[PDB]
Design a protein around this ligand. Sequence first.
Ligand SMILES: O=C(O)c1ccc(-c2ccc(F)cc2)cc1
Ligand SMILES: [Ca+2]
Ligand SMILES: [Ca+2]
Ligand SMILES: [Ca+2]
Ligand SMILES: [Ca+2]
Ligand SMILES: [Ca+2]
Ligand SMILES: [Ca+2]
Ligand SMILES: [Ca+2]
Ligand SMILES: [Ca+2]
Ligand SMILES: [Ca+2]
Ligand SMILES: [Cl-]
Lengths: 359, 358
Amino acid sequence: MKFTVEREHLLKPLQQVSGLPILGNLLLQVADGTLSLTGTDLEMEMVARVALVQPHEPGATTVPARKFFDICRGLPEGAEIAVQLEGERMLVRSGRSRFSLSTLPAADFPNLDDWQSEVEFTLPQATMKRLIEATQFSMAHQDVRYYLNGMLFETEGEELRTVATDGHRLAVCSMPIGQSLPSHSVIVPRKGVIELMRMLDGGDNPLRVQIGSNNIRAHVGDFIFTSKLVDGRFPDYRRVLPKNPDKHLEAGCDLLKQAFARAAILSNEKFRGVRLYVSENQLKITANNPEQEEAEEILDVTYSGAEMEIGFNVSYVLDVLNALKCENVRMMLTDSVSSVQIEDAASQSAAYVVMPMRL
Amino acid sequence: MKFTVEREHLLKPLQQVSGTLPILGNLLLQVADGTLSLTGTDLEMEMVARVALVQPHEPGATTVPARKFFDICRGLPEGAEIAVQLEGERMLVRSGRSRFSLSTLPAADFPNLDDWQSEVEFTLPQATMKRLIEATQFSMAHQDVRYYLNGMLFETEGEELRTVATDGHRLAVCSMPIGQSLPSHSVIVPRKGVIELMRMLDGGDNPLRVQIGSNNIRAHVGDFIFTSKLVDGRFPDYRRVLPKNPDKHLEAGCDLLKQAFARAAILSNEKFRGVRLYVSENQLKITANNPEQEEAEEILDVTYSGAEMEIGFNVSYVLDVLNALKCENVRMMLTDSVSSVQIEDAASQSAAYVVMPM
Ligand SMILES: O=C(O)c1ccc(-c2ccc(F)cc2)cc1
Ligand SMILES: [Ca+2]
Ligand SMILES: [Ca+2]
Ligand SMILES: [Ca+2]
Ligand SMILES: [Ca+2]
Ligand SMILES: [Ca+2]
Ligand SMILES: [Ca+2]
Ligand SMILES: [Ca+2]
Ligand SMILES: [Ca+2]
Ligand SMILES: [Ca+2]
Ligand SMILES: [Cl-]
C-alpha cells in the first residue's frame, strides 16, 4: 500500500472519520484510484473517499487515528504526505519529517452488519441542517428512557420531520422535501445525530438518506455515514402540542431573551422558575430564589388576550429563544395550568413546547 | 446609600473586583465624598476600584453578591443608567423597567487586610509590566510543596525590575529598565496575585505605581488599587540556573523549530515527553519514540558551527519557551549532554529561559 496525497486533501476526511484499540484506528484502503478512510465505534461508521492523482499502490491497513491526524495537521500547509506500509509499521514522510506508526490488520477492522434500504430520499444539506439544529438541544442525555437519547426522524407525505424531547420540553421541526414518502419513523442515537450534523457543510452536494429496519445511512459527496437506529418507541409529539392556544404574545426575540436572561439570575438555581404576567400589550417577568432575592422585567409586547399568569423553567425558555435565531417570537398561551408553544413569529416550521410551573 | 451610574462606567470596575465563608463572595460598596468604591477580597489579596460619581448620590456602605450584581449590570443594555439604593437589608438595582433586589451582608463584617508600610516604590509603564509577566508566568510551579515556587520573584536591582519564575525543572527570567534608581530587593508574589496583577493591565497609557512592603505588594493603575500578601521563603538564584558558559550557539527560525518539536512530540512518551536533539554542522535532528516503538524524526537547517553533541529534553518545556517567545529567530545555547540549555530570542537578551536535560 502506497499513496502520496496533499495535506489539505486529507484534513477534512480525517476530521470526519475521527471520533478495543482498533476502534481508535482508521482503516486505510488504496483501491481503484481511491484512498478510502473509515472510522467506527461499532454503533456507527464514517467512510471518506479521496481521489489519488499521484502514483499509488493498492492495499489496506489500520493506523492510530489521533496520531495520524495530528501528524498530518502538524505538517506545513501544502505539504505532500507520502505513506507506505513497511512490515508491521506505517511510514509517513513529508520533507525531512519522518514517522513510523504502529498498525493493526485491516482484516480485524469491524464492519456493521449488512442490511437493506427500505426508505430513501434526497434533500439539500441545508434542509437537513435546519431540521437537526432546530431540535438537537432538546434530546435527552444518558436518560434511563434510552429511546429519548436521540432524535426521531419521521417521513409523512412530502415532509421530513425531526422531534426531540428529554421528557420535559419538546422541539419539533418539519420541512417539505418535494418527494412522496412512506409514513415512517426512526430514532437516530444522540451521537449519530451529532456526527451526521458534523458531516454537513450545507453546500451544494445533495444529501441522500437511506433508511433500513435497524440502520440509517447518509451520503454526501465523498462521505458516507452509517448508524444503527435506537430500537424503541418514541413519544407522539401530537399529544403534547397544546389544543387551541388562543392567547398569542409576539415580541422581538432579543428583547425577550435579554429580559429572561436578567430575571434568571435571581431564579432558583435548581428549578429555575420564573413567572409571566401578560396584559394589554405588556409582559412582566418575575423571578425569586430561596434567599428571597427578586427580579422584575416589564416589556412592551403585542398581546390582546385575557390577562393571565403562567410560570415556567427559564432555562428551557432561553434554550428555545437561543435555538430560534429569528427577529420576532410568538408565545402561544392558554392558561396557567397548560403548556406554552413557542415559534418564530414568521414561521410555523419549528415549534417548541415547555410545561407550566406552579410557583 | 444611593448612586446612579452609567453601565459602561461600572462593568470594568466590577470585572476587576470580581475575581465557603459567604462574605468573600460579596463586594463592599462605599459611597463617600465624590466616589463609589468597590472592593473584592479573598483574604490573600484585594482589589479596590474607584468610580467618580457625577450624578446625585447619598453616602453609605453595604456588601452584595459579586457575581449576581456583575451579571445583572452586564446583562443590561448598552447605555443603561443603573440606579442603586439600599433599602433595609436589601440592595435595589434599577434600570429602565428592570428591577432587582439583592441580599446584603453588613459592611462592618467585610474583612480588611492588615495595615502596613511602603518600603520600596517605583513607577513603570503598563507595557513594561505586561512584558515582564508574560515573559515568565508559564514557568511558575502549580502546587509544588516548595511553596516559594508557586509564585513569581519580583526583583529590583540598579534601575531594573526583573521577574523570575521556575518550577525546579525549567526557569524563565526577564529584566527591564525603568529609569529610577532602585534599592536591591526581592519579593515573591503568589501566582494568583500575578494573574490578577496581569489582568489589571488592560491596557492603555496609564502608568503603574508599585509599592512593596515587608509582607505586601500594592499596584496602583488608573482608578484601581491591587494589594497582595507576599510568599515567604528562599527563592532560587537565577544566576545559578543560567549556564556558566553555554558557548555552543545554534540559531533557527522560531516557528520552524516549534512546529518540528510539536510534530516530534506526538510520538514521545505521554508522561515523560522525552525527545533527543542531535546538533551538528548547520543541522539539528530531533527524534522521539514511545513505549510502542513508534518513532518521529525531524531534520532542520540551522546556523551552528560548534562541536557535535546530543541532549535529551522534556519537549513540553521546550514548546512552552518557543510559544512564549513571539519572535523571528531563537538562539539555543548549549554546554554538554548533561547540562541545561539556555534559550533566547536571537534579537533580544531581555529574557532568558533555562531547561534541564532529561
Ligand atoms: O529546589 C529548588 O529551589 C530548585 C529551584 C530551581 C531548580 C532548577 C534547576 C534547573 C533549572 F533549569 C530550573 C530550575 C531546581 C531546584
Ligand atoms: Ca493530492
Ligand atoms: Ca465513527
Ligand atoms: Ca411542525
Ligand atoms: Ca422587584
Ligand atoms: Ca455616570
Ligand atoms: Ca480580589
Ligand atoms: Ca535578563
Ligand atoms: Ca524514523
Ligand atoms: Ca556537569
Ligand atoms: Cl420565581
